[PDB]
């Protein structure tokens, strides 16, 4: 409560520098606390309302602060004092601050008494809903659901009218905004108002000229179906959903595929069986790749939530034949979207069906031309491993892993490198030593530096799974052998490997088995190796005992400080000083 720095913070609300403006805004709580409730009302809030800011971060942070200001303005009796600055912010050009302003208005609404909602909050929504700019009408949309439950019947009827007006606005941006809020507004209306008022609106927006509006009707579907009795769904929701699923716009068909599981849950197992599965099959056979891909991504979840009584059968007779087609879809994104979820069907179908019907699909995708498809299969073995031994698939995984490891394109090589630790844990240390070790060592001498770097980082992760003993036995000798490579790019890689290995191999292995090579490399003919010796000694130094630093490391670094190359002098000096050897 020392007040001068607070007087400074207030002053800096209007500083030329955005950074100071931002700092003050973020400390508005501190300022209001020191002013007390009266002055934060009579000075602080009007002061803020009349300042023009044009910076997103500042406006955002202001809108956020005001949402928390209830106690600071004197409690619920005075919350309505926050309406005017928030009403402006819900009106600026930048959409993101408008959204924050409505989020804060929504938070503050709960602090309004019912009569304060009617006296202050509702007129704000009306002014916004009646605004000249679509932009303020957009804001209004997010504000109905918070004030509706707690006002009188007469006010509720006005709100329903205002909302109907937004749904049929001459500007499509506003219709879109209303569509997006239909579901949440429906969640607060009386059930018979949902039936008589929400359904017509829902049906109108579902047949809008703009597909931007139409596509939002599938999410409204989800919310409306959740609220409605199951036996009202065929009458009130299904005809609109069926229309959405075969809409001329791929974007709306897409949304039904994207939301398919939620529809499945809301609509219930009976409607799912008779209506949704034929719909799902159609989505899988859609003329547009993006829709088939979205559908493909849902096969697991969809099959998983069918009722127990119909599950196996509808999968076998209805879904599986579609899945077989999709495995040879001409579009790669579709094949790879399926690849990433398909083996998740393994436990759902049990051992026998997996072997007979899924395994061929698994192998086919594993032999696929597209690396993304093979990568998606290879990285999702966890589910099939429960039902069938992952060790039983080794013979098929091996050639696929090798082929990706040596792919002409380095980002493909990077992708398989990143899954290597996962694969090493699932296949076991024995299979790894036998079949994969040489693959991992070959990447350390890849032509592409990014691959070398990823491979050196891979070794650390391998050590964390298999231990420092395995590292000393199977990894380190091959790493040190590279110190004799005629190409300096490869000799440096030894030092980079030592860098990461000493984080996990411990003081003894580092000291006895890695450090002698580092010290020896200080006499390398190329300066880049010599200065990376210095850098490595700095890096690993804290794993080394103080005696070692003193008797072995210090003398080498001292020698390096008298090299003819400027960078080796510099990094030797740095090493000496950060290790406290100077």
């Amino acid at each position: 409560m020392s007040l001068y720095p607070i007087a400074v913070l207030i002053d800096e609300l209007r500083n030329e520098d955005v950074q100071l403006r931002l700092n003050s805004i973020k400390k508005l709580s501190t300022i209001a606390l020191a002013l007390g409730v009266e002055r934060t009302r009579s000075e602080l809030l009007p002061f803020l309302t009349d300042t023009i800011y044009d910076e997103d971060e500042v406006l955002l942070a202001l809108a956020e602060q005001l949402g928390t200001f209830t106690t600071l303005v004197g409690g619920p009796e005075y919350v309505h004092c926050l309406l005017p600055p928030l009403e402006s912010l819900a009106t600026v050009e930048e959409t993101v601050v408008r959204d924050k302003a409505v989020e804060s208005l929504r938070a503050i609404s709960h602090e309004h008494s019912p009569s304060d909602l009617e006296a202050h909050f509702v007129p704000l929504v009306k002014r916004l809903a009646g605004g000249d700019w679509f932009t303020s009408r957009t804001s209004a949309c997010g504000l109905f659901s918070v004030c509706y439950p707690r006002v009188s019947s007469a006010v509720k009827a006005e709100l329903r009218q205002y909302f109907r007006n937004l749904c049929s606005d001459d500007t499509p941006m506003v219709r879109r905004a209303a569509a997006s809020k239909l579901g949440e507004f429906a969640k607060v209306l009386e059930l018979d108002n949902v039936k008589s008022e929400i359904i017509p609106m829902f049906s109108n927006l579902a047949s809008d000229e703009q597909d931007s509006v139409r596509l939002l009707a599938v999410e409204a579907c989800v919310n409306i179906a959740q609220l409605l009795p199951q036996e009202d769904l065929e009458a009130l929701v299904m005809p609109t959903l069926r229309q959405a699923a075969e809409d001329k716009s791929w974007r709306v068909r897409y949304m039904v595929a994207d939301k398919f599981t939620e529809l499945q849950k809301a609509v219930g197992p009976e409607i799912t069986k008779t209506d949704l599965v034929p719909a799902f099959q159609n989505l899988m056979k859609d003329c547009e790749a993006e829709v088939r891909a979205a559908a493909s991504h849902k096969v697991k979840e969809f099959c998983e939530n069918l009722s127990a009584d119909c599950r196996e059968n509808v999968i076998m007779s209805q879904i599986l034949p579609c899945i077989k087609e999709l495995v040879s879809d001409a579009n790669q994104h579709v094949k790879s979207a399926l690849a990433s979820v398909i083996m998740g069907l393994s436990p759902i179908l049990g051992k026998d069906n997996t072997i007979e019907h899924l395994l061929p699909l698994f192998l086919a995708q594993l032999k696929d031309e597209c690396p993304e498809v093979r990568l998606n299969i290879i990285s999702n073995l966890d589910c099939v491993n429960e039902v069938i031994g992952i060790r039983q698939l080794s013979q098929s995984l091996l050639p696929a892993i090798v082929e990706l490891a040596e792919d002409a394109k380095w980002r493909v090589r990077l992708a398989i490198i990143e899954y290597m630790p996962l694969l090493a844990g699932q296949l076991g240390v024995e299979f790894f030593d036998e079949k994969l070790n040489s693959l991992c060592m070959a990447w350390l001498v890849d032509h592409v530096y990014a691959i070398r770097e990823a491979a050196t980082s891979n070794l650390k992760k391998l050590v964390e799974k298999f231990g420092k003993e395995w590292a000393h036995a199977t990894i380190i000798p091959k790493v040190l052998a590279m110190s004799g490579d005629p190409n300096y790019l490869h000799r440096m890689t030894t030092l980079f490997c030592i860098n990461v290995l000493s984080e996990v191999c411990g003081q003894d292995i580092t000291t006895k088995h890695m450090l002698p090579t580092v010290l020896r490399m200080a006499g390398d003919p190329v300066a880049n190796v010599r200065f990376n010796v210095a850098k490595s000694l700095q890096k690993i130094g804290p794993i080394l005992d103080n005696s070692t630093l003193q008797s072995e490391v210090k003398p080498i670094l001292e020698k390096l400080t008298q090299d003819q190359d400027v960078d080796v002098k510099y990094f030797a000096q740095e090493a000496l000083t950060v290790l406290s050897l100077a």
Binding site: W410, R411, H447, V448, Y449, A450, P486, N487, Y488, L489, M492, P525, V526, A527, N528, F531, N532, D565, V566, D567, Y570
Partner: protein, 295 residues
């Protein structure tokens, strides 16, 4: 206090890797320091192997980052850039500043040669002037960089045997000594030996011809051989000309063209490439596509 400036330069480099320009005064300071370093370098700058040789970048900052992903980071890997850092792309500023900041920080780890686009007249029409004006609001940064370009070496010689330069041969130069006698410290002329080193192209025609570009010459296999044998060279390594493969051998391997701006101007569809020369000067090539930016 050399300690403190080193720390400052490391953060400039770090900031530039996040694709953020330096301020006008930082650029001014960086350029004074680079002039002081470049002024000690020869018109035929001696470079030791191992070194990785790169061609044109033309402000393609995101592809320069990709290049570093392929060749390794400075200072760990040594680089020789053959010019054309600036113009055409959207990030000429961040591109030249990164490279001269690396030269100033690591003068033995990197060599930067002059391209035909590091020139007052060419930058005024091919984008670099305009980029600097937008990013700084006045013409000073442009002035500082174009004054500095005057100091950039014209050619390099790696290990006595591999001659690197941006453009190509000139009928006004028979010997490396003739190059060393030139005065490099001026704007690139429209004609003469200096111009030719930065403008000429190798050709399928025999002897010398006139460049279709409007400056410099074309030269054929017979010219490259005479020049190499007379100067004790293994190879002329050069840039300047887009090649679809990123690199291209010609003249019975007396000449190689290396071009390091993939999908040049979002239009040309080429791979990019760099040339690694290892500890005993053996060559190898690394081809690359533009970095993804996806979202």
């Amino acid at each position: 206090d050399e300690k403190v400036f080193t720390k400052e330069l490391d953060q400039w480099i770090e900031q530039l890797n996040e694709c953020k320009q330096l301020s006008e005064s930082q650029v001014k300071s960086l350029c004074e320091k680079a002039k002081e370093i470049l002024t000690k370098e020869s018109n035929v700058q001696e470079v030791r192997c191992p070194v990785t040789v790169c061609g044109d970048v033309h402000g393609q900052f995101h592809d320069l980052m990709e290049l570093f992903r392929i060749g390794g980071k400075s200072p760990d890997t040594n680089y020789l850039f053959m010019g054309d850092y600036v113009d055409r792309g959207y990030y000429s500023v961040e591109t030249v500043t990164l490279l001269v900041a690396l030269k100033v920080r690591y003068r033995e780890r990197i060599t930067i040669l002059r391209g035909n686009h590091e020139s007052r007249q060419i930058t005024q029409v091919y984008g670099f002037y305009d980029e600097c004006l937008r990013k700084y609001g006045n013409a000073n940064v442009w002035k500082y960089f174009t004054d500095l370009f005057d100091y950039l070496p014209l050619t390099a010689l790696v290990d006595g045997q591999i001659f690197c330069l941006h453009g190509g041969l000139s009928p006004s130069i028979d010997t490396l000594d003739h190059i060393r006698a030139l005065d490099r410290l001026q704007e690139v002329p429209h004609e003469g030996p200096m111009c030719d080193l930065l403008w000429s192209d190798p050709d399928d025609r025999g002897g010398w011809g006139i460049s279709p570009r409007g400056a410099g010459y074309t030269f054929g296999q017979d010219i490259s051989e005479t020049f190499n044998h007379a100067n004790g060279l293994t190879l002329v390594s050069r840039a300047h000309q887009l090649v679809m493969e990123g690199y291209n051998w010609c003249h019975d391997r007396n000449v190689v063209t290396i071009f390091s701006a993939p999908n040049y101007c979002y239009r040309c569809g080429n791979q990019a490439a760099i040339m690694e020369l290892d500890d005993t000067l053996k060559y190898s090539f690394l081809q690359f596509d533009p970095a993804p930016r996806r979202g």
